[PDB]
Amino acid sequence: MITRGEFFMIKEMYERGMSISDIARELGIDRKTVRKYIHSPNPPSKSKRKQRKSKLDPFKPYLQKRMLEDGVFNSEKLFFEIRQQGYTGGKTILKDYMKPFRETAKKKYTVRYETLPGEQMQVDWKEVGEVVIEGKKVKLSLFVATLGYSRMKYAVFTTSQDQEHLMECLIQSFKYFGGVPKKVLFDNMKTVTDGREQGVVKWNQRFSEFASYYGFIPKVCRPYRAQTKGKVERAIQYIMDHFYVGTAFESIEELNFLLHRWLDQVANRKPNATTGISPQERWAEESLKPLPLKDYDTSYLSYRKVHWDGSFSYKGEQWLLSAEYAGKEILVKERLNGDIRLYFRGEEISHV
């Protein structure tokens, strides 16, 4: 088992012409050993041995059954049990054998990553809570979109977290940043996925079409791990401890106006604590893909029938349609702003 260096030295000194016996004398090795190593391929310094029997082998299946069906992980309890069965050794071997079965405590070290310019964006929601806006109880939610390289922040308040609202907020973010990223990171929302099909993710077909339309590649971090999108979560903490702490409002339009003004004043103006530069300069450094001229229409699409007289009803509303549109089927495109339009076989109805 002469080590790498010893074997190299033996072979080299032997090939140099030095006599073998005095080589052995110099290196303090037996002459037979040195001579055998002369005609050897490479330094031998490794011995392979397979596993061997231990004391806790007969009890091992029983302990494994205890762990995997009774959920017992108390080394003292298992030791006391098996001691009656016949075991006589200490607990160290038991702990060593049982350690792999134990759950892996979550780490505390946190890797840091710096995405390339115009290469990544992050999105998330924040359930603000229930408020009485204009005498109406609604569930307010905050949508936050954080750029990855410039740390920009766009935000907007909404009353619902429907796929339509998500897509519209993404449109607003893309317009705000003057382009679309090459990658957009969400969490595992059903408006973007439909579960992990054996490790792989199954994208919602409509959302996949939307992404292919705007060209941005979706990504999802992982189940029950929000660290991977720390930028946007920390931006949420920033906004909810700086803007929505004492600000008072009565209309969501007013709140959104105040939020945009606040962002453009301080949030996207104050230099970041890590990049140490105003986010707008980095934004100017960003290179996002151009937006399409026509935005992906995100509006509720329903089919309704006009009554005999010509009175058409949608939600708690009523219209008066010409007699030619009575008893037929029409399309009611409801934009998220409340602009309802009526269509009949492509044509647009001048609804009264």
Instruction: Note the residues at the interface with Mg ion (CB under 5 A).
Output: 124-125, 187
Question: Can you name the residues that pair with 130 across neighbouring β-strands?
Answer: 139
Binding mask 280-309 for a second copy (x = CB under 8 A): ----------------------------xx
Partner whose footprint covers residue 187, from a second copy, Mg ion, none (CB < 5 to 8 Å by kind)? Mg ion
- One of 52, 99, 108, 136 touching a second copy (CB under 8 A): 108
* Positive or negative: CA dihedral 321, 323, 325, 326: positive
Shortest distance (Å) from residue 285 CB to a second copy: 24
Partner whose footprint covers residue 53, from a second copy, Mg ion, none (CB < 5 to 8 Å by kind)? none
At residue 315, what is the residue type?
K
Task: Give the CA count within 13 Å in the CB-facing half-sphere of 62.
Answer: 14
Partner whose footprint covers residue 350, from a second copy, Mg ion, none (CB < 5 to 8 Å by kind)? none
* Positive or negative: CA dihedral 202, 208, 212, 216: negative
Which is nearer to a second copy, 109 or 224 (by Cβ)? 109
Shortest distance (Å) from residue 86 CB to Mg ion: 54
**Residue 275 engages a second copy in binding (rule: CB under 8 A):** no
**Is residue 239 a contact partner of residue 232, using CB atoms and an 8 Å limit?**
no
- One of 110, 198, 337, 350 touching a second copy (CB under 8 A): 110
Partner whose footprint covers residue 224, from a second copy, Mg ion, none (CB < 5 to 8 Å by kind)? none
Shortest distance (Å) from residue 273 CB to a second copy: 12
The pair of three-digit structure tokens given for residue 185, joined into one six-digit string: 């990171």
Shortest distance (Å) from residue 255 CB to a second copy: 34
- One of 310, 314, 319, 335 touching a second copy (CB under 8 A): 310
The pair of three-digit structure tokens given for residue 249, joined into one six-digit string: 């409002």
Question: Can you name the residues that pair with 341 across neighbouring β-strands?
Answer: 333
Which is nearer to a second copy, 165 or 229 (by Cβ)? 229
Shortest distance (Å) from residue 144 CB to a second copy: 22
Residues 6+ apart with CB under 8 A from 308: 326, 327
- One of 48, 112, 294, 315 touching a second copy (CB under 8 A): 112
Region from 102-110, 126-134, 145-153, 197-205 binding a second copy, contact rule CB under 8 A: 102-110
Total residues at interface with a second copy (CB under 8 A): 8
Shortest distance (Å) from residue 309 CB to a second copy: 5
The pair of three-digit structure tokens given for residue 256, joined into one six-digit string: 């959104």
The pair of three-digit structure tokens given for residue 157, joined into one six-digit string: 């308040």
Q: Which residues of this protein are in contact with a second copy, per CB under 8 A?
A: 108-110, 112, 308-311
